[PDB]
Amino acid sequence: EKDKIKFLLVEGVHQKALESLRAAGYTNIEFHKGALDDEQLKESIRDAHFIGLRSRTHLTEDVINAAEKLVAIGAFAIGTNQVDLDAAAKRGIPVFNAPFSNTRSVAELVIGELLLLLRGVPEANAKAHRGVWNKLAAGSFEARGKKLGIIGYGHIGTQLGILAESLGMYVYFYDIENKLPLGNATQVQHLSDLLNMSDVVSLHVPENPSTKNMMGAKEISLMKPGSLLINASRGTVVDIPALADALASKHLAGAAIDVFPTEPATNSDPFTSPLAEFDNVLLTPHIGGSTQEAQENIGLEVAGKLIKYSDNGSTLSAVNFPEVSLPLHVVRRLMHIHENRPGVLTALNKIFAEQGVNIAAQYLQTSAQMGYVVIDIEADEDVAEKALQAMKAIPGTIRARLLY
Amino acid sequence: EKDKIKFLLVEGVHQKALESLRAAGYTNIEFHKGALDDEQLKESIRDAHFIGLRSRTHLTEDVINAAEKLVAIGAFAIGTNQVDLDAAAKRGIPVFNAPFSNTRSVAELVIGELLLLLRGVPEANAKAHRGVWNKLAAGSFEARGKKLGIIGYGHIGTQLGILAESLGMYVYFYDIENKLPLGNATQVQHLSDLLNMSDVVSLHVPENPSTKNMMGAKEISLMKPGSLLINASRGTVVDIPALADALASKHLAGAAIDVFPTEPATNSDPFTSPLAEFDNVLLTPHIGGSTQEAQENIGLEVAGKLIKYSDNGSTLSAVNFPEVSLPLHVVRRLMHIHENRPGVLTALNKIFAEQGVNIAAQYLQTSAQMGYVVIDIEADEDVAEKALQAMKAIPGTIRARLLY
Amino acid sequence: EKDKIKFLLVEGVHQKALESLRAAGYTNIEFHKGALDDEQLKESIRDAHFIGLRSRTHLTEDVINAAEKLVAIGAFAIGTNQVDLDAAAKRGIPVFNAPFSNTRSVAELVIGELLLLLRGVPEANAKAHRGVWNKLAAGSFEARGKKLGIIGYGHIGTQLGILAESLGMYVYFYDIENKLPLGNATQVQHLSDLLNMSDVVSLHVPENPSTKNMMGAKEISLMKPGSLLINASRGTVVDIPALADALASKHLAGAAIDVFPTEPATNSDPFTSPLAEFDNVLLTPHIGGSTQEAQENIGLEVAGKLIKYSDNGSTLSAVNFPEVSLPLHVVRRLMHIHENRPGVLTALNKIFAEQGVNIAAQYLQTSAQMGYVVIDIEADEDVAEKALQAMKAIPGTIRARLLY
Amino acid sequence: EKDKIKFLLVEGVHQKALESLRAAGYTNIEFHKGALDDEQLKESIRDAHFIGLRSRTHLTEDVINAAEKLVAIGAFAIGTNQVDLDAAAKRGIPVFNAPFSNTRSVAELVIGELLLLLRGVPEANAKAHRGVWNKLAAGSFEARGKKLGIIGYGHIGTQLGILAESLGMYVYFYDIENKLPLGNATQVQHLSDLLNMSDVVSLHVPENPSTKNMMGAKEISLMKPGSLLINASRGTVVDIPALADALASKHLAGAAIDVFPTEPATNSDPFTSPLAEFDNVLLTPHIGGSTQEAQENIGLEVAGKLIKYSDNGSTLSAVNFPEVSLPLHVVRRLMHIHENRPGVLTALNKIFAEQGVNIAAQYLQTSAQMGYVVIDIEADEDVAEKALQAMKAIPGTIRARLLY
C-alpha cells in the first residue's frame, strides 16, 4: 500500500530525495519546482500523507488544518521557522529537518572569501568594472602563514579549520565547550586573545542570547588592526553599524557577510545595508548554504528521516516531538500518540496482557503534553489489526498506526 | 662592504632588500618609493655602482651608457624587458632578476577565484552592492569532487595542482611536454579532452607564437557548458571577444582574468574591456604576483644576487652574462671581463707567473663574444692592486676589478 | 553515589578506572593487584555490588550464586570466557567488557616486528648476545616499497594498513567479506595470490572453525620464498610444526608469534615451542594488547559502563542482557528485570496508573527468556520506594531497584 | 675505446652499478663477489683503470703502487678509511664515496627498534627463547603520544623525525646549526632540555672531537628516567661503561646500539661488550646501513660519480682531491693534474694562445699541493691530441687526459 501513500514536494527538493524515496517503495509523489500559492497548496496537501517543503513555503496552522491525512513533515532545509511546529505537534505530526547537511558548502565559502579578501580582490574588481585600474602589492597577502581565528568550533568550524590548515594557516579557535582540536588547531581560552592574534576571524555559532551581538564595537576593536571578519553564521551575531565604523576607520581591511539582521523576503525585494558603500566588503545573500551538494545531502537525509518514521516509527531528531527509536528485532510493531497523562500506557499494555500476547519491546518518550510510544509485539496481522482498533479507542489517543 | 658603493633602488622594492644590503656593509643607498623621470633618473645613476628597479623603469642603451660607474643591475621582478641586456653585457654589466618568485601567489589567487566563481559569488556580490538580493543554489557547486583542468603544468600549474588536490578536486593537465605528475594529477594527451571534461580551466602558459590566441572561439566552445575559465598567465592567450560571446551566451558561467592584451600604463589610465559588463567576471589589475610575501622573497633573493657578486664575483643566474661561481677559500680574488678571443687568458695568467705569484683557483666561462673570469691568487694587497692595473691593459679588456 | 556500594576490583585494573569510580561518588572499593584463591575471592564478593576482573578470574555459576549482592560484572578485558554469562543473566546481572580496546597496540606491535624481521635484526641481536658478530646486507630490506599482505581486514587489519601505508608499503588484504579499502589498500580475491605476492603476511582473524589451522603447510609454501609471517590474532591459526619446517627450510626468513595453541597458565609455568630454537623468530608472551595506553582505555571505558548502569540503568553494550538506554530527563527512574512472558509490563504500569502517577518515559527490551525495563515517573521519593516494593511482587520478577 | 677501459669491482657491489655502467658504454668489467687476497688483488688491479671496492678491501699505498693504469677510485660505501687517500692524491687519482645513500635504511631501523624497545619485546623474546614466559603490561608503551628527541638533525635525523611523526610522536631535536624544522619538529636550544623531555633519544651525528663521548654519564643521567637511548650514529659518541651502569640502575629502560668503540674486524672475529649481559638492549653489528636498497642507492651514485669523472672530468664531491666541474657546453675538453706551483697554468694556456686556439671555459681548483684544471677549447681532435702531448710535458705535470 506504499504506492497509495502520497508525498507532496514543493520548492523543488533535490532529485536525490526522489531517488531515495522511490527506492523505499513510496512512488506516489506530487513534485513542484516552485512554491505554491496561498491556495493551490491547500488543495494539494488535503490528501497528502507527507509534505516536503523548503524555506519559502509557509506551513501555517491554517494550512495544517487543511490536511486531513498528514503524517510527518519534512523540511528539506535547515530552518523550520516557516512551519508551525506547535500546530503539527498538536495533531501528532513530527517535523524533521537537516541541521548539518551544509558543512562543506559553508567552509569552502569562507576559504575562498578569505583568499580573495586577503588579496584585496573585491576592491580591485569593483574598480575594474568601473574602468579604474588599481595595481598595488602594498597590503596584499597570501594566506599561507596567516592566523585564522574560528569562533564556534562545531561542525562547520572544524571543517573550516582543516581546510585552512591545507592552505598553510595557523588555525586557532574559541568555543564555550572545551574541545578536542583536530590536526594542529589550538584552543584559546579567552576570546579577546583569539581576536588580538587573528588575521582573519570567522564566526560559526548558533543563534541565542549568548550570541546576540557577540561581535560588537568592543569585540571588533579588539581585532588585530588590518584584519578581516567573516560572518556566515547568524544575522544577529555581529553589530552592523559597529562593523561599518570599523571598516570606515580602516581598522579592519575588509569583511564578508552572508547573513544580516534583516534579510529581504524574496529575490524581488530590495536589500539595503550600510555596508553596500564598501568595495572591500563581500556581501552575499545568505548562500553559504546554497550548493547543489548541500541540496543533495539535504535531499537524502530528510527523505530518509521521513522514510524511517514511515517504516519503523523512528522520531530520532524530530524537531517538535518526543524522540524515540527502537532496533528492528521482531515482526510486528505499532505506534501510539496520546495526551501525556496518567493511565494511558497501562490501558495500552492491557490490550495484550488480557489476551496472552507478549510484548517484545517498548519505547515511550514524553513531551510536556504528548507521548510517542512504539511497541513490538509477538502476534500476527489479524491480532494486530485488532489491537490497533482498540488502541485507537484509548481515552487520550490522538493517533495510532500499525507500522508493520 | 665600503659605505661608498652607491645603490640606487627605485619603484619601492621590499624593505627586506635594504635589510640584506645593510647586513652586508653596504649602507650607501638611495631609495625611492616609485619611478623617476628621465632627468632625475639620469642624475641618480651617474655615480651608482648598482641599480635595483621594477617594471616601470627603462634602462636603455643611452641610459646605461651614461651610468658612469655601473657595476650590476638587479631586476626586482620576474621580467627583464625593461632593461637592455645586450647593451649592459657590452659594458660588462650583469643583469639579475627573480625567475620563479611568485608561483605561490598565483596558485593561491587561482584557488580563491575558482571557489567563488564556482559559487556564483562574484555576481551576487555585485548585485548586493546595488540593492538587489539574489539567493540561488541552482548553478552553485562546491569545489570538492570537481575536475580542474590545468593548461601548462609548470612551476605554477604544478603548485596549483597540489592546492586543488588538497581541496578535493580531481586534477587533470594538458602540456606540450611529457611531465611527471605530482600527487594524483593526470596528464591528458588531447587538449580537446581536457576542455570537454574540466569544470574549471586555468591557463598557465608562457608568452610566445604558440600561445597567442590559444583560447579562441573553437577552444572555448569545447569547454563544458556552465564551466569556468581562469587566466593569470599572459594577456595574449585569450580571444577576449570570443570570451565575451561565450559569456553572454551563458556557455561559460563566469571567468577570471588577471592579464589583458593591452594593459594600462599606470593607475591613472582608463581600463577598458568587453568583460567589464559582466557581473559574473573577476577582473584584476594583473596582481597574481602582487603580494607582500612575494615582494619580500624577491627582495631577499635579488639583493642577495647583487651582494654575492659585489663580494665574490658570482654570476650564477645572471641573464646576460657567462655564469661563474668560485667557492671562497684563499684571500685574494679578482675578475676580468673581455672580448672572447684567443690570447687573453694566457696574457692574464702570465701577469702572475712571471713574478712568481701562485694561482690558487680560477673559473672562466664565455658567451658568444664575451668571456668572463674570476681568479684566486696568493699575494699581499699591493701586488694585487698592481697586477689589476696590468690586467686593465690586456688587449681585449672590457672591465676588471679587485674583490678582496 | 553512596559510599556503601562495594566494588571489588581484581587483577590490577588500571588506576584510571579508580579515578573514574571516585569522580562519580563511589569510594567504597576493594582493589587487588592480582587474582585471588577460591576462598578469599568468595570472601571479598559476598557483599559486593560490582566486580571488575581480568582474564585469570573465573566467575562460575557457584561463585556468582553466592555473590549475594552482585549488581553487575565488568570484564576489564576484551574477552568474557572467564565469566558465566548465562548464570549471571539468570540472576539479572549484566556483564560488560571492552570490545575493541587495543586495535592500536596490536597494529603498532606488528609494524615494529616487521621492520626488524625484514632486517634480520632479531637474529643479529641473538648472535651478538653470544659473542658472535654478523654484518650482512644480503637478505636485508627496507619496509618502503614492499608488499604487506593483511589476512583479515577488520578493526586491527585496517588500522595496521594505514600505519604500513604511511611507511610506504603497498597494502593488500584478503577477507571473506567484501570490504571498502581505506587509503590505497587493495582487496585480493584469492588467498593464494596474496600469499605468493606479499613480502610480509600478518594474520588478523577471529577464533572459529574456519580459522583453525588456516595456515598449514600448503598455505605456508604458497608464501614468497624469503618472506615473513606474523601472527598476533589467535593461537589456533597456524600449524606451528609446518612453520618450524618452513623456517628450517629457509623458505621463510623469519616470523613473529604472539599467541600459541597452548599458552602458559602463569609467569611461572614453562614455555615450550619448536620455534624457540630459531634465532630468526620473535616470540612474545601474548602481549599485543598489553600496553599501558590500552589498559587505561579499557579502564576508563569499563568503569564507565558500570557507573552509567549503576546510575541510570544503561545496558548499551552489555554482553548477556537486553540493551536499553534512556536519556535522563525527569527525576525519578526505576528498573525491573523479569521472566519474559506476557502480562508483566501491564502489571508493572498498573502499579502507577491506579494511583494516578504519570509515566514520563520507558524502555523495554527482551531476550529469549528475559526482559528488561527502565521507567521514568513523576513522583516524590516515598511513592517510588513503595511502588518499587510492589514491583518486586509482580509475578515473573527477578530483580528490581530504584536508581534515583 | 670505452670497452678497452677496465673496471675492477670487488666485494660485490650492487648489480645496479653494473647496469648504470653498461648503460654508459664501459663494458669491460671484472666483478668479484668477495674480497680479494693479499695478492690476487694486485694481479687484477695492475691494468685496471677504475677499481670499485667496499669496506673490507684494504687499498693501501702498497697496492696503489701496483696499479699502473688507475684513474679514479670508487668506494661503494660510506667510509674511505680502508683507502690510502694521500697515496691516491699523489698519483693523481680521485677517490669518491656515497656518504648519504643510506638515509632511509637507518631511520627505518631506529623506528622498529623504538617500537619494540618501548614494548619490552627484546626482553620478552630472550626469555621466550629460554623457555620463560613473561607477560606484563606494566611499563609497556605505544609510541603514539611519546616524545622522541633526535640529536643531530641532518640527513638521517630529518628522515627519522618525519617517520616518527607518521606514528604520532612529538619530534624534538637538537643540532648545533640552527635549522628549518620539517613538519612539526621543534628545535630545542639546550641539549639538557631535550634530554629531560625525551622518552627516546636517538643520536645522528658525525665523528669528531665535538662528538667523542657526547653521551657520557652526565648526559645519560639527564635523560628522563625510564627512557631509551638509541645510537646508530658513530661508535665514539656514547660512553659504554656509563650506559651499562645506567641500564643496571634501571635509570634507562633499554637501548639499541649499532656501533661500538671497537668493532670486530670480520664476522669470524669475536664480539665482546659489557652490554651483552642485558636482555633489554638491542645489539646489532653495524647494520643500520645494511640493506639492499642502500646497496642499490650506493651502487648507482658511486658508479655515476666514476662515470662522470671519466666522461666529463668532474671531481665534485671527491674526498681527497680539489673539486671541479664544468657545464658541458662545447665540443673538446681536457684535464690536467699538476704540482700546485707558480707558472703551470700560464704554460698550459700558452699552448693555445700561441696557436690561435680559443679557450671556451676553464676551471682550476687547488689543494695544498696539487691542481685539477679542466678546460674547454674550440679546436678539433688533431689539434687537441697534440695539445695533450704538450700539456703532458709541462714541468710539474702529474697526469693529463683528453676527455672528449
Ligand SMILES: NC(=O)C1=CN([C@@H]2O[C@H](COP(=O)(O)OP(=O)(O)OC[C@H]3O[C@@H](n4cnc5c(N)ncnc54)[C@H](O)[C@@H]3O)[C@@H](O)[C@H]2O)C=CC1
Ligand atoms: N550561512 C549559512 O547559509 C548557514 C549557516 N549555518 C549556521 O552556522 C552556525 C554553526 O553551525 P554548525 O557548526 O553546523 O552547528 P554547531 O552546533 O556544530 O556549531 C555550534 C558551535 O558553536 C559553539 N558556541 C555556541 N555558543 C557559543 C558562544 N556563546 N560563544 C562561542 N562559541 C559558541 C558551540 O560550542 C558549538 O561548537 C549555526 O548558526 C548554523 O545555523 C549553517 C548552514 C548554513
Ligand SMILES: NC(=O)C1=CN([C@@H]2O[C@H](COP(=O)(O)OP(=O)(O)OC[C@H]3O[C@@H](n4cnc5c(N)ncnc54)[C@H](O)[C@@H]3O)[C@@H](O)[C@H]2O)C=CC1
Ligand atoms: N599573473 C601574473 O602577474 C603572473 C603571471 N605569470 C605567468 O604564468 C605563466 C606560467 O609561469 P610558470 O609556471 O613559471 O611557467 P613554467 O615555465 O614553469 O611552465 C610553463 C609550462 O607551459 C608548457 N607550455 C609551453 N608552451 C605551451 C603551449 N603552447 N601549450 C601548452 N603548454 C605549454 C611548458 O611545457 C611549461 O611546462 C608564465 O607566462 C608566467 O609569466 C607568472 C607570474 C605572475
Ligand SMILES: NC(=O)C1=CN([C@@H]2O[C@H](COP(=O)(O)OP(=O)(O)OC[C@H]3O[C@@H](n4cnc5c(N)ncnc54)[C@H](O)[C@@H]3O)[C@@H](O)[C@H]2O)C=CC1
Ligand atoms: N594479540 C593479542 O593479544 C590480541 C589479539 N586480538 C585478535 O586479533 C583478531 C582480530 O581482531 P579485530 O581486528 O577486532 O577483528 P575484527 O572483528 O575487526 O575482524 C576480523 C576480520 O576477519 C575476517 N574474517 C573472519 N573469518 C575469516 C576467515 N576465516 N578468513 C579470512 N578473514 C576472515 C572478518 O571478515 C573480519 O573482517 C581477533 O581474533 C582478536 O581477538 C585482538 C586483540 C589482542
Ligand SMILES: NC(=O)C1=CN([C@@H]2O[C@H](COP(=O)(O)OP(=O)(O)OC[C@H]3O[C@@H](n4cnc5c(N)ncnc54)[C@H](O)[C@@H]3O)[C@@H](O)[C@H]2O)C=CC1
Ligand atoms: N649506523 C650506520 O650504519 C650508518 C651511520 N651513519 C652516520 O650517521 C651520522 C649522521 O649521518 P647524516 O645525518 O647522514 O649526516 P649529516 O651530516 O646530515 O648529519 C650531521 C648532523 O649532525 C649535526 N651535528 C654535528 N655535530 C653536532 C654536535 N656537536 N652536537 C649536536 N649536533 C651535531 C649537524 O649539524 C648535522 O645536521 C654520521 O655519523 C653518519 O656516518 C650513516 C649511515 C650508516
